[PDB]
Amino acid sequence: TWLSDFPQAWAETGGMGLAVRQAPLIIPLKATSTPVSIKQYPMSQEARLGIKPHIQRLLDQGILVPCQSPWNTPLLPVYRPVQDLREVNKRVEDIHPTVPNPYNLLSGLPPSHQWYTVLDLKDAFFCLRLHPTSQPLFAFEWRSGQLTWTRLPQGFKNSPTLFDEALHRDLADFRIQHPDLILLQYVDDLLLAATSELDCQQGTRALLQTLGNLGYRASAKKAQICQKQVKYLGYLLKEGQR
Amino acid sequence: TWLSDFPQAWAETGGMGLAVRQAPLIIPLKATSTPVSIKQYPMSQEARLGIKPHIQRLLDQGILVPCQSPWNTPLLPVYRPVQDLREVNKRVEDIHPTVPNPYNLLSGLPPSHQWYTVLDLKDAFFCLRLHPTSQPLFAFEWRSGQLTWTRLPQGFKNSPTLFDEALHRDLADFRIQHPDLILLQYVDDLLLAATSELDCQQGTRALLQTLGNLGYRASAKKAQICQKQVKYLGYLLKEGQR
DNA sequence: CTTAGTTA
DNA sequence: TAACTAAG
DNA sequence: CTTAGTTA
DNA sequence: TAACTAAG
Structure with a gap:
């Protein structure tokens, strides 16, 4: 078929x-933007275990990679990972x-x-794909260090x-x-x-x-x-x- | 001087x-109006004694007279008498x-x-002066019977x-x-x-x-x-x- | 006292 | 939705 | 979890 | 002003 x-x-x-x-x-960032690093709200073990295999699959696929970035946004503690990119969105050129x-x-x-x-x-x-120069924009914390998107x-x-x-x-x-x-x-x-x-x-x-x-x-x-x-x-x- | x-x-x-x-x-009344008789909210003795000599003076002056009317609106229980004529106002031609x-x-x-x-x-x-035909419009209770305005x-x-x-x-x-x-x-x-x-x-x-x-x-x-x-x-x- | 209209 | 505010 | 916008 | 509502 x-x-x-x-x-x-x-x-x-x-x-x-x-x-x-x-x-x-x-x-491209807006002309006045600088990085914002928002603390990760503590995540319950229940949420962490729920999200974990999704994160592992993305790492296996090369869609997430480890990084160190001056940018950080939170994953929602309440599965399947959802990132709050609103503070990043505000800094990106329309x-x-x-x-x-x-x-x-x-x-x-x-x-x-x-x-x-x-x-x-x-x-x-x-x-x-995301250019390596733009990848650090989208970083989040995972536990310990940061990960970010290559797509x-x-x-x-x-x-x-x-x-x-x-x-x-x-x-x-x-x-x-x-x-x-x-x-x-x-x-x-x-x-x-x-x-x-x-x-x-x-x-x-x-x-x-x-x-x-x-x-x-x-x-x-x-x-x-x-x-x-x-x-x-x-x-x-x-x-x-x- | x-x-x-x-x-x-x-x-x-x-x-x-x-x-x-x-x-x-x-x-003149609006074309569909009929009389409205609104009950008098009970008045405290304090209020009654406050208002009384004003009512007596108006009676002495012929500005208030006794009446029996199908219209009635309330005097405010909280001196000097203030009549709530809003329901009458609604029925009078603009x-x-x-x-x-x-x-x-x-x-x-x-x-x-x-x-x-x-x-x-x-x-x-x-x-x-108010024409006698229009006087009953403005009646209120005083204690017992009604009074109304001749002006x-x-x-x-x-x-x-x-x-x-x-x-x-x-x-x-x-x-x-x-x-x-x-x-x-x-x-x-x-x-x-x-x-x-x-x-x-x-x-x-x-x-x-x-x-x-x-x-x-x-x-x-x-x-x-x-x-x-x-x-x-x-x-x-x-x-x-x- | 109730109530029409505005602000919080 | 609740709270005021100005009125009659 | 926070938050921008709407409704009550 | 509080309460929802939809979102990231």
Whole structure:
């Protein structure tokens, strides 16, 4: 089936992603910013044990590395690790928000394309590398020393925009090679639209092959492939309605 | 002095006023109104004894009379009697508010008239009679039976406007007979302005004589007569300033 | 006393 | 939501 | 855990 | 002013 033909494209089979064509991102600070080091709220053993294997997996994957940084933000003591990056966000230069609202994005769907494929990318932000100069920005304490992210982190205010822009650059060629297909991108949520079941299945094969090649990974479990009706961005797409 | 020449004009000497040229006022109700009878909150003996001689004086003066009315509003249990006429006010037809704001009224004072007389009328509203058909509107309980007002009452939403309009009608002739004088009226607060101390003193004599004749009474105690500087409506009038 | 409107 | 504030 | 924004 | 509410 779909899973077997494209082992590289699916998170289930291809391993953790890494966007090989994308240069490691440099994150510019506002002109007056200096590092802020916020103390870690003491964590209960229950929370620590809950979070631990997630931290170990990320270390194993090279997504977290040890560091010493003048920056520090807290992990929430209440599992799965959630970092409060608000004080970092305040010190990072704003970028223009280029991610379209879903209502506007969907206006780009013609009544002519009614065969749909929906993919969502797994651990999307983690596919984007962070330049070593920007890594220390995102440090947190783990017990003893600090760890930090080598990839675009959750909770960082510019992650959705930077990811959406990176994927747009990576999929520019695909769009050109398949000028009849409709591809909607909302950060990590993709909808491919076609006129026929055949166009859709050939399109979908090409999109998966392309994604896998670029280093992105889709969720095989959640994939809606070549259906006349799909869920996308909390809409039900059917009869060309919605 | 001023007090002796005009015994009729001063509250101190002329007795309680009564505007003899003014027809007893009829107070129109809104189209859907019916009487409201609000129970009297029990009054402490302390309050009752405090209020009593005021009530007796008003009865002696014919300003309050006994009655039986389907209307009733409460006197406040916490001296000097204050009637809560809000439920009556809600049922009475609105009139246009014609009393100018003091800021606008004072704009009518030319730099040329800098000799001032200020009078305030004592118990102004009580000078205006209420038509017997409208008297029952304002009834309250006194202990046992009801009493009501035979004159325009305090706390009634249209009293200031109706009084201001009535006094304007009564002083229309005076204005015509003294076209050089400036007369400002703000309900019961009057300012007469003149070019010279002589004009002011002759004007003031005429205004007092006219007021006394019409049945209004000014406070001799508070009167500011023929001064180059006076207090009027919480302003200090001096040098033509304010 | 109750109550319409504002501020905390 | 509670507390004031100004009023009748 | 803290905190910016809304509602009560 | 207190209480929620959604977030990082």
